[PDB]
Amino acid sequence: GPHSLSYFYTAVSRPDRGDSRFIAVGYVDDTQFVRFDNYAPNPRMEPRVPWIQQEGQEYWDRETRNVKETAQTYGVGLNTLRGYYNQSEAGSHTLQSMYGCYLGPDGLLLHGYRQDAYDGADYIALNEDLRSWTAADMAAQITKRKWEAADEAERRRSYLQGLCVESLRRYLEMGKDTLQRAEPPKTHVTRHPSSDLGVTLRCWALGFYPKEISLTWQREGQDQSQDMELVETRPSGDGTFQKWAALVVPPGEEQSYTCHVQHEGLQEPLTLRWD
Amino acid sequence: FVARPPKVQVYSRHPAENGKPNYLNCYVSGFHPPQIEIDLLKNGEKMNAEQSDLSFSKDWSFYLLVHTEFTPNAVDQYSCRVKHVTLDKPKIVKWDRDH
Amino acid sequence: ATAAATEAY
């Protein structure tokens, strides 16, 4: 699918104690490329992958300044929301923000988004048209009236249609050899007995990128999806991902089951079996 | 105000093999609030390990990766210990080269 | 590149 640039902000109040902490991470597709964390002294926006390191000092200065000012805004925001909900000043709360753009075939914004959450729940979000907001509750409706009167949606739209996509197309170039390379998973099937009438067959997918993948089991061409164990896709540690799908079968029917792996890194979808 | 417990996976980067250097991973996700303590243990003792930058999934729940280099053998026991407000007591997940 | 600070909550 289409490439995307996205940022994820987490602000956490520390009462008090008596300030916040603010963390930002930036991704291109499933690859983290920058981070900011004012838990560190003299905080700076910093590179998290080789290909971004080549940005000049002015970029890093501008990004740093920008996020530090954003951190201040979220510090104030936490105080404001505590007020909206008439909550105790002694408790810590979270304000999360999620925004990004997707690149279309014409090199323009395919679609963009901006979503915010308070204490882990939807608070306010920009609608698909990038021109109106959806408030989750009465408190968010106060924020909404402020953002409507302030032209926040129009600034967001211009960013998403402008700087966001422009930056994305740039990063995609800089990190060509890695961002635009599909890394197929290395696969195999393992067997793990249990009692006499149970045997776990596990289909592995290792070191793949991007994150999107399909692992399914079939019993003579019939899907076995409902008794299948599917783990959450997990980071390999090197920028790639891992995943596996297991299912218990009769200790003799091993040959009667097939694992099917679909990943854009493959030439053809795979069909694995236990040997 | 709503707390979600951490899910934990402990695993190696490459297929385990005694004597061969590898990488030990403890992936923790689905939790909230963000405050959490995650330690990789070797025979019950804390290891040097680095932690990823705090991020979150589409459902707002946080995830972190704690990981370190290690050379698996036939003796050493590895595990991940996780402390979170949602947890009655520390969550200890022993490493299994089969899962 | 990051967006400028959002309006106040």
TrEMBL record, chain A:
Cystine connections: 101-164, 203-259
Example GO biological process: immune response
Taxonomy, superkingdom: Eukaryota
Lipid bilayer topology: Single-pass type I membrane protein
Cellular component terms per the entry's GO annotation: lumenal side of endoplasmic reticulum membrane; MHC class I protein complex; phagocytic vesicle membrane
Reported function: Involved in the presentation of foreign antigens to the immune system.
Annotated family: Belongs to the MHC class I family.
Record-given protein name: MHC class I antigen
Taxonomic classification: Eukaryota, Metazoa, Chordata, Craniata, Vertebrata
Residues of the full protein shown: 22 to 296 of 361
UniProtKB/TrEMBL annotation, chain C:
Signal peptide per UniProt: none
Subcellular location: Virion; Host cytoplasm
Family to which the UniProt record says this protein belongs: Belongs to the filoviridae polymerase cofactor VP35 family.
Assembly and oligomerization: Homooligomer.
Function: Plays an essential role in viral RNA synthesis and also a role in suppressing innate immune signaling.
Protein name per the record: Polymerase cofactor VP35
Species whose genome carries this gene: Sudan ebolavirus
UniProt gene name: VP35
From-to range in the entire protein, with total length: 143 to 151 of 329
